[PDB]
Every structure is written in C-alpha cells, then in structure tokens.
Design a protein around this ligand. Structure first.
Ligand SMILES: *[C@@H]1O[C@H](CO)[C@@H](O[C@@H]2O[C@H](CO)[C@@H](O[C@@H]3O[C@H](CO)[C@@H](O)[C@H](O[C@H]4O[C@H](CO)[C@@H](O)[C@H](O)[C@@H]4O)[C@@H]3O)[C@H](O)[C@H]2NC(C)=O)[C@H](O)[C@H]1NC(C)=O
Ligand SMILES: *[C@@H]1O[C@H](CO)[C@@H](O[C@@H]2O[C@H](CO)[C@@H](O[C@@H]3O[C@H](CO)[C@@H](O)[C@H](O[C@H]4O[C@H](CO)[C@@H](O)[C@H](O)[C@@H]4O)[C@@H]3O)[C@H](O)[C@H]2NC(C)=O)[C@H](O)[C@H]1NC(C)=O
Ligand SMILES: *[C@@H]1O[C@H](CO)[C@@H](O[C@@H]2O[C@H](CO)[C@@H](O[C@@H]3O[C@H](CO[C@H]4O[C@H](CO)[C@@H](O)[C@H](O)[C@@H]4O)[C@@H](O)[C@H](O)[C@@H]3O)[C@H](O)[C@H]2NC(C)=O)[C@H](O)[C@H]1NC(C)=O
Ligand SMILES: *[C@@H]1O[C@H](CO)[C@@H](O[C@@H]2O[C@H](CO)[C@@H](O[C@@H]3O[C@H](CO[C@H]4O[C@H](CO)[C@@H](O)[C@H](O)[C@@H]4O)[C@@H](O)[C@H](O)[C@@H]3O)[C@H](O)[C@H]2NC(C)=O)[C@H](O)[C@H]1NC(C)=O
Ligand SMILES: *[C@@H]1O[C@H](CO)[C@@H](O[C@@H]2O[C@H](CO)[C@@H](O[C@@H]3O[C@H](CO)[C@@H](O)[C@H](O)[C@@H]3O)[C@H](O)[C@H]2NC(C)=O)[C@H](O)[C@H]1NC(C)=O
Ligand SMILES: *[C@@H]1O[C@H](CO)[C@@H](O[C@@H]2O[C@H](CO)[C@@H](O[C@@H]3O[C@H](CO)[C@@H](O)[C@H](O)[C@@H]3O)[C@H](O)[C@H]2NC(C)=O)[C@H](O)[C@H]1NC(C)=O
Ligand SMILES: *[C@@H]1O[C@H](CO)[C@@H](O[C@@H]2O[C@H](CO)[C@@H](O[C@@H]3O[C@H](CO)[C@@H](O)[C@H](O)[C@@H]3O)[C@H](O)[C@H]2NC(C)=O)[C@H](O)[C@H]1NC(C)=O
Ligand SMILES: *[C@@H]1O[C@H](CO)[C@@H](O[C@@H]2O[C@H](CO)[C@@H](O[C@@H]3O[C@H](CO)[C@@H](O)[C@H](O)[C@@H]3O)[C@H](O)[C@H]2NC(C)=O)[C@H](O)[C@H]1NC(C)=O
Ligand SMILES: *[C@@H]1O[C@H](CO)[C@@H](O[C@@H]2O[C@H](CO)[C@@H](O[C@@H]3O[C@H](CO)[C@@H](O)[C@H](O)[C@@H]3O)[C@H](O)[C@H]2NC(C)=O)[C@H](O)[C@H]1NC(C)=O
Ligand SMILES: *[C@@H]1O[C@H](CO)[C@@H](O[C@@H]2O[C@H](CO[C@@H]3O[C@H](CO)[C@@H](O)[C@H](O)[C@@H]3O)[C@@H](O)[C@H](O)[C@H]2NC(C)=O)[C@H](O)[C@H]1NC(C)=O
Lengths: 276, 235
C-alpha cells in the first residue's frame, strides 16, 4: 500500500543553521561543515559585533561554492535598514569587505542541490580600516585620498592625481527653479558673478553647456542685488572662457539665465503616414 | 506584451535590449550617452562578470542584426542600489555603464528623468513594451510589442493583492478586468507616460503575482524618489 519506498526523505524544513552572534575573541568560523558539504535549503545569519566607532574588515581564506543559484550577502544594518555592500558568489578568490558601521550581517542562501565545500571567514577589527590616510599640509581631499596643495578646484587642466575632478564651480544662488537662477563662479575659494556687462549669446550658450543644459534662452539682467567679489568673463578666440578677476568695482550687473531643457526622447523618427 | 500590438521601427528609440550568453534575459533603457537603467532583480548574482553582458541598441527584430542600425556594446561597471533586500522586493534599481559613448541619431534617443514635485493622478493611460512571452508558456521571437494600461492607487493595489508589503515605494498598474499584463518575460521594460509632447520615465518593471488574472495589478518601481541617486553619477 505505501507507494513511497522505505527510504529517508530529505525532510529539511526551516533553516537549521548555527551560531548567530560572535565577538572579537573568536574570528575564524565555518558555516556548517567546511571539509565535506553544507545542507541544502539553508538560511543561516551571522552577526559580527564590534565596539562603537570601530569598523569591521572581513576576509575569506577559502571560497568555493556553485554557479550563481547560491549567493552570499553582507549587510551593515539589520536594525532598521541595511545596504547590499558587497555580494560574492561562484568559485574563485574574493576581495575583502569593509563596513562603515560597528555591526555587520552575513547571510547564506542555498538551493536544494549542488552542495559544495563552503567557506571560512577572517574576523578583523580596527579604526578607519576602509578609510585612507587623511591629507596633510592643508592639501585638497580627493575621492581616492590623494593630497595636492592646489592643482584642482576647476583649474584649466587635470593635474589632479585621480583625474576624475570633473566638478564645475558653477551653481544657481537663490533662483526660482532648477533652470532659473543667478550664475556664480568660484575662481579659488569665493563664489561670484561673471560681470555680464559684455554678455553675449555665445557666452550664455557656453554657460548653459557647462551646467548640462540646452542653449541660451533668456539673458535679461535686473540689477546688482549682491555685492560679492565681481569678476569679469569675456569671449576668447578658442573654445574656452577667460575669467578675469576685477574685484572692488562699481556699476555692475548680475546674471539671470534660464537655460532651456536638453533635447530628449521625443519621437523624431520619420514615421510613414498611413492613408486610412 | 501580453495582448498588445506590434510596434513599428523608431516608435520607441529609448528601449534597448540586454543579452547574457546569447539569450535575452532582461530589458534596459537609455538615460545618457553612456548609462543605462534596468531592474536590479534580474541582474543579481552576475555582477562579478561584466564582460559576459552584451548591450544591443536599436533592437527591432531578432531575425538578424546585420542591418546598419544595431550597435553592439559591452558593460564595464554595474551598480546596484544599496536599498535592496530581495525579501520585500522593494527598491530594485540597477545602473549599467557602457564602455564607449554612442552618437545620438534618429533611432537612438534617451529617456527624460522626472523632476521633483511631479504628481501623476491614477487613471492616466501610460504605455508599456517588451519582448516577453504572450502565451504564458512560450517565447517571443518577433518585433517589439506595445500596449496601454491604466494607473491604480496604492490603496487599491493593497486591497486587490493583500499578500505583499506594497508600501509607498511601488507603483501598480493594470486593468481591473485583466487581459493585458506585461509582467512576464521582460522584467526590465520601462513604464512610459507622456506630458505635452515629451515622454518621461514612470517606473521600472518588477515582480507580479500572475499575468492576465483579474484584479492582479503589476508592480513598478518608483522613479521620482531615485532621481537624485541617478543624477549623482549620471555625469
Ligand atoms: C538670496 O536671497 C536672500 C534672501 O532672499 C538674500 O538675502 C537678503 O538680502 C537682502 C539685501 O540684499 C536683505 O535685506 C535687508 O536685510 C536686513 C537684515 O535682515 C534688513 O534690516 C534690511 O531692512 C532695511 O530696511 C528696513 C526698513 O526701512 C530698516 O528698518 C532696516 O534697518 C534696513 O535698513 C533689508 O531688508 C535680506 O534681509 C536678506 N535675506 C536674508 C534671509 O538674509 C540674498 O542677498 C540673495 N542672494 C543673491 C546672490 O541674490
Ligand atoms: C560619432 O561622432 C563623432 C563626431 O561627431 C565621429 O568622429 C568622427 O570620426 C571620423 C572617423 O572617420 C573623423 O573623420 C576623420 O577625421 C580625421 C581627422 O584628422 C581625418 O584624418 C580622416 O581622414 C581625412 O584625412 C585623410 C588624410 O589622408 C584623407 O585621406 C581623408 O580623405 C580625410 O580627409 C577622417 O576624415 C571625423 O573627423 C570625426 N568627427 C569629428 C567632428 O572630428 C565618430 O566617428 C562617430 N561615431 C562613433 C562610433 O564615435
Ligand atoms: C566564542 O567566544 C566566547 C567568548 O567571547 C565563548 O563564550 C564563552 O565560552 C566559555 C567556554 O565554555 C564559557 O565558559 C563556561 O561558562 C560556564 C558558565 O556559564 C553557564 O551559565 C550561564 C548562566 O549563568 C549560561 O548562560 C551558560 O550557557 C553556561 O551554561 C561554566 O559553567 C563553564 O564551566 C565554562 O567555564 C563562557 O560561559 C562563554 N561565555 C558566555 C557569555 O556564555 C564561546 O564559547 C566561543 N565560541 C566557541 C564555539 O567556543
Ligand atoms: C535582416 O533582416 C532585414 C529586415 O529588417 C533584411 O532587410 C531587408 O530584407 C529584404 C528581404 O526580402 C530585402 O528585400 C530584397 O532586397 C533585394 C536587394 O538585395 C539584393 O539585390 C540584388 C538583386 O537585385 C542582389 O544581387 C544583391 O546581392 C542583394 O542580395 C531585392 O533585390 C529583393 O527583390 C528584395 O526586395 C531588403 O532589401 C532588405 N533591406 C535592407 C535594408 O537590408 C535583411 O535582408 C536581413 N538580412 C539577412 C542576412 O537575412
Ligand atoms: C587571516 O587570518 C590569518 C591567520 O593568522 C592572518 O594571518 C596573519 O597575517 C599577518 C598580517 O599579514 C601576519 O603578520 C605579518 O607576518 C609577516 C611575515 O609573513 C611579517 O613580515 C609582517 O610584518 C607581519 O608581522 C601573520 O604572520 C599572519 N599569521 C600567520 C600565522 O602567519 C591574516 O592576517 C588574516 N587576514 C586578514 C585580512 O585579517
Ligand atoms: C524659452 O523656453 C520656453 C519654454 O517654456 C519657450 O517657450 C515656447 O516658445 C515657443 C515659441 O514662441 C512657443 O511656441 C508657440 O508657437 C505658436 C505658433 O503660433 C504661438 O502662437 C505661441 O504663442 C508660441 O509662440 C511655445 O508654446 C512655448 N512653450 C511654452 C511652454 O509656453 C521659449 O520660446 C524659449 N525662448 C526662446 C527665445 O526660444
Ligand atoms: C485610456 O485607454 C482606454 C482604453 O482601454 C480608453 O477607454 C476607451 O474609452 C472610449 C471612450 O469612452 C471607449 O469608446 C467607446 O466606444 C463605444 C463604441 O460603440 C461607444 O459606444 C462608447 O460610447 C465609447 O465612445 C473605448 O471603448 C474605450 N476602450 C478602448 C479604446 O479600448 C480611455 O478612454 C483612455 N483614457 C482615459 C482612461 O482617461
Ligand atoms: C507593510 O509594512 C508595514 C511596516 O513595516 C507593516 O505595518 C506594521 O504592522 C505591524 C503589525 O504586524 C504593526 O505592529 C503593531 O503595532 C501596533 C501599534 O499600536 C501595536 O499595538 C501592535 O501590538 C503591533 O505591534 C506595526 O506598528 C506596523 N507599522 C510598522 C512601521 O511596523 C504592515 O503590516 C505591512 N503589511 C501591510 C499589508 O501593510
Ligand atoms: C503641448 O501641447 C500643445 C497643444 O496646444 C502643442 O501645440 C501644438 O504644436 C503643434 C506642433 O508640435 C502645432 O502644429 C503646427 O501648427 C501650425 C499652426 O499653428 C501649423 O502651421 C504646423 O504645420 C503644425 O501643424 C499645433 O498647432 C500646436 N497647437 C496649438 C493649439 O497651437 C505643443 O506643441 C505641445 N508641446 C510643447 C508646448 O512643448
Ligand atoms: C566690452 O564692450 C565695450 C563696449 O564696446 C568695450 O569698450 C570699447 O573699447 C574700445 C577700445 O578702444 C580701442 O582704442 C584704440 C585706440 O586708442 C583702438 O586702436 C582699438 O582698436 C580700440 O578701438 C573703445 O574704442 C570703445 O569706445 C569702447 N566702448 C565703450 C562703450 O566705451 C570693451 O572693450 C569690451 N570689453 C571686452 C570685450 O572685454
């Protein structure tokens, strides 16, 4: 009568993992059984605790799983919110993971087949492990941590070591919307207008291009509301713009530009007309 | 997709396809000269091998791409939104970077990101597209298909599908009587709605209970709450 043969079925409900929370004294750990295999359809969570204000650095001595059905997730939250941080899967060595908080969460998800050896971790604690050395001698702080006295801040070159200093010293003060506002430029440390006394349409187009927008729509001045360190902008024979500092000047005028929105996904395709 | 109509050449220049191992897996949209947007759910666990992804622009027919309208591309960097858990299926947005810039032409156009303080009331018709299956048990090997679906509120979506944490970061759409549901096959298709002769981005295709079933609206990821994140590295 029993259709099922007298053999043990898998019968693995829930997860049945292992330890959940650990601390500094114990560092190395394996998920379930490193030498042989790990159970299928398992979901075990490890919580790495650390002192307040200290970062956590994680390393893997060995890491050999399956293809892509099984993934490992590392999170720094698990309290109210968390970020994916770094996810590693598949055979091959993996890089170390740094966390900006004092708590790290490690998750393991597996399918029902294709068991593998597993992985082992390497728990390390320290101060500013993922943060490079701070700059000295009042040098500029870059994204990669390189220190340079003054080769940046919108210079007419890319002398910065990183080479990714594409930021522009132009922004709209006050204004009415994103596309409307007073144009200000920062030569070295101070933001100021560009002395639109000799303003032309080409200058407006160049300024709009520098802001990632269309062409010059409106360039009507009103009056010099601000008394900042006015500097002069003028046309140049080449494609660049020359900004001449002319501070301590009277009888000036600000800049009021409303750059048109860039061309975008309008159906400009020459679709045929159906005679119906 | 399901129950829709075939589209013509150049109808939706901002819809691009993504290949992995010679098979279509997920959709994408063009944002700028060297950036793409796609659902983070489909691109998961494959972020360690960017060289295995092939990007196709101007894809209209799957017969042959030898025509002078398909430009092959490769993905150099893949960015996944940190606010993702794969448990509540909330905030699944991924960004992909192309190795080289692509010149804009008649058949290639980008999408227009929505601005802040924009409100879209429910009931407005928006268009959808994709290369997903139409028989629910097969595949699609024809030209791109398009369809129009209405808009539904969060409360209506929660009432109709009280099985997920819908929250306020998701957009639901679909007819009350069913018939058309493009949540199967192509999970990277964009949700497009227009405003005075300009098509914007409304949502990104996400999971769904089951297509064509009555009172089963789709799920789309909100874009107005992620505009700043995209513009941070849009460049
Ligand atoms: C960007 O916008 C901000 C605010 O919109 C703007 O700052 C404002 O600047 C104006 C002058 O340019 C300020 O106006 C003065 O402010 C002082 C101090 O608040 C007041 O005392 C002044 O009142 C005079 O008149 C009164 C009546 O006769 C007198 O009783 C009084 O003693 C003064 O003589 C005058 O209103 C204004 O206060 C600021 N606003 C703020 C919030 O600080 C800024 O200049 C704009 N920047 C650019 C680049 O456009
Ligand atoms: C995207 O758009 C960009 C620009 O919008 C485009 O770049 C163009 O590339 C072509 C490549 O064929 C350039 O044309 C060449 O220009 C160089 C400049 O020195 C010339 O030397 C080339 O040949 C000339 O000189 C030869 C000397 O013996 C002559 O024999 C020959 O007859 C030519 O006179 C050739 O003309 C073109 O200049 C650029 N565009 C610009 C604005 O510089 C790019 O190809 C487009 N596509 C992609 C995928 O990027
Ligand atoms: C990882 O490091 C941890 C330290 O940071 C280890 O935890 C400690 O491990 C030792 C080794 O056995 C334990 O020492 C035992 O302590 C018990 C007394 O605790 C008992 O009673 C309390 C209630 O008061 C109960 O909660 C406990 O579970 C025990 O039943 C002694 O009776 C034993 O003889 C022995 O000395 C420590 O107790 C333990 N710390 C804590 C806070 O429990 C941990 O073992 C390390 N991991 C591994 C895998 O070894
Ligand atoms: C990939 O799919 C495309 C569809 O988007 C194909 O494009 C069109 O395919 C049709 C097929 O019927 C072509 O129509 C034929 O064109 C030929 C002209 O090409 C031949 O011309 C002479 C003969 O006159 C021959 O000696 C040449 O070697 C060419 O082979 C006409 O002669 C026929 O009567 C018929 O109209 C379209 O021309 C073609 N258009 C374009 C823009 O390519 C494409 O062919 C498909 N590619 C492959 C490899 O199958
Ligand atoms: C993963 O766990 C292992 C287990 O100990 C850690 O190995 C230890 O690593 C440190 C730092 O590299 C070694 O100290 C260094 O030794 C070299 C000589 O090889 C010496 O020239 C250096 O000045 C420094 O003292 C330490 O010897 C090594 N342990 C053993 C037993 O050799 C490893 O650091 C852990 N990885 C991470 C990322 O935490
Ligand atoms: C600066 O940008 C604004 C965008 O709001 C441009 O406004 C647009 O201007 C065009 C051209 O005047 C308007 O076209 C219309 O054409 C009909 C044809 O008869 C005419 O009757 C209308 O009076 C109007 O000119 C378009 O509607 C208008 N857009 C909006 C939303 O009002 C403006 O033109 C740009 N500035 C420059 C100098 O191009
Ligand atoms: C959004 O798209 C839907 C498509 O489902 C639009 O629904 C359509 O509305 C029109 C106007 O009521 C319907 O036309 C009807 O035609 C019959 C023909 O006998 C006529 O008797 C009715 O009085 C009515 O005029 C149409 O059937 C209906 N469905 C379609 C076109 O598939 C809707 O209007 C659009 N706009 C919204 C919802 O704001
Ligand atoms: C969608 O997600 C929200 C937020 O995560 C869920 O709302 C939460 O539901 C739980 C019930 O399981 C609430 O807990 C209850 O709170 C009341 C407050 O007086 C307390 O008296 C009860 O004893 C119980 O603890 C919780 O407050 C509520 N909000 C939050 C922020 O957690 C919601 O259930 C999810 N599902 C749906 C369909 O909305
Ligand atoms: C926003 O919606 C308005 C609707 O009022 C659009 O205005 C319409 O724009 C089209 C061109 O895109 C105009 O068609 C042209 O009309 C002129 C005569 O004015 C004709 O000579 C041309 O051959 C062409 O047919 C249409 O007339 C115009 N409607 C009105 C009432 O003026 C506008 O384009 C939309 N987009 C915006 C403002 O960005
Ligand atoms: C901004 O625009 C004003 C207005 O055009 C420019 O001021 C004019 O400057 C010229 C320059 O005078 C020179 O005089 C030389 C002989 O002494 C002569 O060889 C040379 O070619 C040039 O003419 C002056 O003539 C005008 O009278 C000035 N206009 C006014 C209204 O005062 C000013 O240079 C412009 N600044 C720029 C472009 O940076």
């Amino acid at each position: 009568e029993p259709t099922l043969v007298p053999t043990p079925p898998p019968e693995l409900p829930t997860d049945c993992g292992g330890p959940f929370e650990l601390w500094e004294p114990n560092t190395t750990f394996s998920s379930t059984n490193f030498p042989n295999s790990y159970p299928n359809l398992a979901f075990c969570v490890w919580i790495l605790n650390a002192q307040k204000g200290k970062n956590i650095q994680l390393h893997f001595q060995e890491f050999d799983l399956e293809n892509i059905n099984d993934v490992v997730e590392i999170r720094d939250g698990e309290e109210a919110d968390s970020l994916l941080l770094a996810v590693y899967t598949g055979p091959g060595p993996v890089k170390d993971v740094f966390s900006t908080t004092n708590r790290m969460t490690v998750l393991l998800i597996t399918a029902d087949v294709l068991a593998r050896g597993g992985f082992k971790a390497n728990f390390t604690t320290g101060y500013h492990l993922g943060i490079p050395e701070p700059c000295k001698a009042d040098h500029f702080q870059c994204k990669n941590g390189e220190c340079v006295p003054l080769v940046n801040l919108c210079d007419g070159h890319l002398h910065c070591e990183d080479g990714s200093d594409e930021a522009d010293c132009v922004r709209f003060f006050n204004g009415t919307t994103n596309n409307n506002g007073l144009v200000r430029f920062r030569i070295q440390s101070i933001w100021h207008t560009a002395c639109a006394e000799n303003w032309t349409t080409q200058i407006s187009n160049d300024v709009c291009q520098l802001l990632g927008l269309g062409s010059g729509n409106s360039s009507k001045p009103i009056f010099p509301t601000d008394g900042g360190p006015f500097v002069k902008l003028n046309t140049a024979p080449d494609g660049h713009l020359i900004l001449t500092p002319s501070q301590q000047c009277l009888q000036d005028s600000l800049i009021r530009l409303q750059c048109n929105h860039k061309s975008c996904g309008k159906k400009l395709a020459a679709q045929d007309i159906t005679p119906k | 997709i399901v129950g829709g109509s075939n589209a013509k050449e150049g109808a939706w220049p901002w819809v691009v396809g993504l290949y992995y191992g010679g098979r279509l897996l997920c959709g994408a949209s063009l944002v700028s000269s060297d950036w793409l947007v796609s659902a983070a759910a489909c691109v998961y666990g494959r972020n360690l091998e960017p060289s295995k992804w092939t990007a196709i622009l101007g894809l209209h027919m799957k017969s042959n791409l030898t025509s002078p309208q398909t430009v092959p591309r490769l993905i150099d960097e893949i960015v996944i939104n940190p606010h993702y858990n794969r448990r509540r299926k909330d905030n699944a947005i991924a960004m992909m970077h192309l190795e080289f810039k692509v010149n804009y032409t008649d058949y290639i156009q980008p999408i227009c990101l929505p601005e802040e303080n924009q409100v879209f009331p429910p009931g407005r018709n928006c268009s959808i597209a994709g290369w997903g299956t139409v028989v629910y048990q097969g595949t699609t090997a024809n030209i791109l298909q398009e369809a129009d679906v209405p808009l539904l509120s969060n409360e209506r979506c929660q009432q109709q599908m009280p099985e997920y944490n819908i929250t306020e970061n998701m957009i639901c759409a679909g007819y009350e009587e069913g018939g058309i549901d493009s949540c199967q096959g192509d999970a990277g298709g964009p949700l497009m709605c227009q405003e005075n002769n300009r098509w914007f981005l409304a949502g990104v295709t996400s999971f769904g209970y089951k297509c064509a079933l009555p009172n089963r609206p789709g799920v789309y990821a909100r874009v107005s709450r992620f505009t700043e994140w995209i513009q941070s590295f849009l460049h």
